[PDB]
């Protein structure tokens, strides 16, 4: 199990090979943030796989130099490039050499023989390496490394440095210069170390912190200040100073952030009349169907749940799960009655009697085919319904053919009347209650729509959610898009109106189309952050002033200037020292 501890200042390294002198330099580079968790480990009486993340850190406390190895990569089957590093009798021995792995890669050590510890070939860490895209050869103490893959460059850094501490990373600051760069080109996702089997070691994970760094005369980093560590350490990154003299500074800007979101589309009122399509008592026939365009309405696809509903609701263009927010453009419900087995003949990549002659939908067609049984209703039987039995060829997409001309089977002209080899193209279905389910006329609709690529008229049905007040949220109201804090208001909006607005033209109010009421708006918060500090010559204790806000969204006080954290109010009044605002002056005294 991990037994954590506190990183302190460890893991600062020269981000490049440049030299400088006595110049505070703010660099934004993956580091080990100050004062964070470090997953710790042992060698006792233990070296699992870890994540490699963006980079790593490392250390160990070696009198005996037992932690000698590293194995990185994606997999550890060799299906990656399998990196490696080994350290033998002070001789640096590296590879990328790639092999089949093992369960307990390790190193052997023996007790008190002529050759110390023996097992210098111990090295059943894997089976055998093959294709090597690089090669090389060569508590009292402390090691520190850093391993980060960037631009195919797996870097390394190090300090082999003495200490006296048993328990943890000593407190202190030492930069890490680079040793190597390998252009290995792997992407390491993990790794494992390799112990010496009869020695603590640590791990961080590099994060994109921004440090202020202080080079010295010789150009050895003597010190650093994380920017994001805490209120004060952002005032040193602003000033580029390790001495922050007295008085109020300004660093960051905090912005309250949206809770979830609010969609609003008018409920009820009017919608896309799916019912004025679907429950029409008699649909048009199959040779001639009903194309009824649907435009500029909140879609009705809700109510399609509770009803007799459909024989099937089947979407050939797009998922019905998409349809809800999916914005159509040109909406066409295809309203007609056919015999039952012909719902199989209305679909893309489908042939048969219907799809060839009296009704056609594309094989790239965009829509949803809908049908349900009219056995209960249309029949009495029902001869109002009919199909075109013969035509000379196969139809085009969306050609309603109402032409009643007689199909001529033979060479002799029919002269407009039936006869030998003259077939009446239009054959009715008698729907008789004594005929089965496959013969049942199904009451058929097909959504025929364009998806995107035409301007916005119809959207999917209402995704409009519930409404939340007095709480910073994101919202969209009927195409009005914005972010703010909705409340109840008293501004009497005009009945035929929609938006309120303001003197700078910015939206100042709205109306809720589902229940008409007047909601104000208001930006999130803003305010700047102002660190109020006595000089770092005196105390690292700072007192932050969040300006121009009310104290929630954050020992708290409240000013006329803003939300002031970390300074106890005082009923005295003294001469001004560090002025804050609205006549409130801080100071450092007891």
């Amino acid at each position: 199990p991990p037994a954590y501890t506190n990183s302190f200042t460890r893991g600062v390294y020269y981000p490049d090979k440049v030299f400088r002198s006595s110049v505070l330099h703010s660099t934004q580079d993956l580091f080990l943030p100050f004062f964070s968790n470090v997953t710790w480990f042992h060698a006792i009486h233990d070296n699992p796989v870890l994540p490699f993340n963006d980079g790593v850190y490392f250390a160990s406390t070696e009198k005996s130099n037992i932690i000698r190895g590293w194995i990185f990569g994606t997999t550890l089957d060799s299906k990656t490039q399998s990196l490696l590093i080994v350290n033998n009798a002070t001789n640096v021995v590296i590879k990328v050499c790639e092999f089949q792995f093992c369960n307990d890669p390790f190193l052997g050590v023996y007790y008190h023989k002529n050759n110390k510890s023996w097992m210098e070939s111990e090295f059943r860490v894997y089976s055998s390496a093959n294709n090597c895209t690089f090669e090389y050869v060569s508590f009292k103490n402390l090691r520190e490394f850093v391993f980060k893959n960037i631009d195919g460059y797996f870097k390394i850094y190090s300090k082999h440095t003495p200490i006296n501490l048993v328990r943890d990373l000593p407190q202190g600051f030492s930069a890490l210069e680079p040793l190597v760069d390998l252009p290995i080109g792997i992407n390491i996702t993990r790794f494992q170390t390799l112990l010496a089997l009869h020695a603590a070691y640590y791990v961080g994970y590099l994060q994109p912190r921004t440090f202020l760094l202080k080079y010295n005369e010789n150009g050895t980093i003597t010190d650093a200040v994380d920017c994001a560590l805490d209120p004060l350490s952002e005032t040193k990154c602003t000033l580029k100073s390790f001495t922050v003299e007295k008085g109020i500074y300004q660093t960051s800007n905090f912005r309250v952030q949206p809770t979830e979101s609010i969609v609003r589309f008018p409920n009820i009122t009017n919608l896309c009349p799916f019912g004025e399509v679907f429950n029409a008592t008699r649909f048009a026939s199959v040779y001639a169907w009903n194309r009824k365009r649907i435009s500029n309405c909140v879609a009705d696809y809700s109510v399609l749940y509770n009803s007799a509903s459909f024989s099937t609701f089947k979407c050939y263009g797009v998922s019905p799960t998409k349809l809800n927010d999916l914005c159509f453009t040109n909406v066409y419900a295809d309203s007609f009655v056919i015999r039952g087995d012909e719902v199989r003949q209305i679909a893309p990549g489908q042939t048969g009697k219907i799809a060839d002659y009296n009704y056609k939908l594309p094989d790239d067609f965009t829509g949803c085919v809908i049908a349900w049984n009219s056995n209960n209703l249309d029949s009495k039987g029902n001869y109002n319904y009919l199909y075109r039995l013969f035509r000379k060829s196969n139809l085009k997409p969306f050609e309603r053919d109402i032409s009643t001309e007689i199909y001529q089977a033979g060479s002799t002209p029919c002269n407009g009347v039936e006869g030998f080899n003259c077939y009446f193209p239009l054959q009715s279905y008698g729907f008789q209650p004594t005929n089965g389910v496959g013969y049942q006329p199904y009451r058929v609709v097909v959504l025929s729509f364009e998806l995107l690529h035409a301007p916005a008229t119809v959207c999917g049905p209402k995704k409009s959610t519930n409404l939340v007040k007095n709480k910073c949220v994101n919202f969209n109201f009927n195409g009005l898009t914005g972010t703010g804090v909705l409340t109840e208001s008293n501004k009497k909006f005009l009945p035929f109106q929609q938006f309120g607005r303001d003197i700078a033209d910015t939206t100042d109010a709205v109306r809720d189309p589902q229940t008409l009421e007047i909601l104000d708006i208001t930006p999130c918060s803003f305010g700047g952050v102002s660190v109020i500090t006595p000089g770092t010559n005196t105390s690292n204790q700072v007192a932050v002033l969040y300006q121009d806000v009310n104290c929630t969204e954050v020992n708290v006080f409240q000013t006329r200037a803003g939300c002031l954290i970390g300074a106890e109010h005082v009923n005295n009044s003294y001469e001004c020292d560090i002025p804050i605002g609205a006549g409130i002056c801080a100071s450092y005294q007891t």
Partner: antibody, heavy 119, light 106 residues
Amino acid sequence: VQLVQSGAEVKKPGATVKISCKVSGYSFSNYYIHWVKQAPGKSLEWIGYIDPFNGGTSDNLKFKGAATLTADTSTDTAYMELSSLRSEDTAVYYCARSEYDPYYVMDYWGQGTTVTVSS
Amino acid sequence: IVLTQSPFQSVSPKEKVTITCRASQSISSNLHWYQQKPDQSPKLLIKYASQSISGIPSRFSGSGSGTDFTLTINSLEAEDFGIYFCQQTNFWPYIFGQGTKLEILK
């Protein structure tokens, strides 16, 4: 006729268990593959039928995992990748071959995919 | 589309068990049936509620009238026991029958 599916899983709530159902013994393209949710200690509950030629699929409202049934015609695999995962999304999900009409006839489903969805 | 089945019916060998799928509100002629032995792929007994799909024994039979949809099972055998599911057809997506666990006496 025959369906080979994804392996056993333990899934985070909110994660996505991707259950492949690969068509063997019949033609992927001629059949809706229905999907059904049998959770441990529960009965069959409809989630959705896929169409093999038609990416658009009816999904269940009910429990809604934003289930998207993707019809893979190269490997003849109807996928159910169930998002919005939950301890009740621990379940044996049977992909069910059936006709492409409003004829839904499903006999030998997937062998079952025993997928725990849990923390 | 709402239906429900009896949670279980415990019947005796050689007795006939007609398992009830009773649909709420609207109904269509098509309906389907199952037996599922625990933790197994449900096997379709009946098709369109009027047809036992091929491969299903003659003791498993099916019918329906209005809201009533029946799996008529006859002369139980001690090995037969399982969980019996039904399927509402059309009229919007479906509630599978909650199943009949077959507990056979004797």
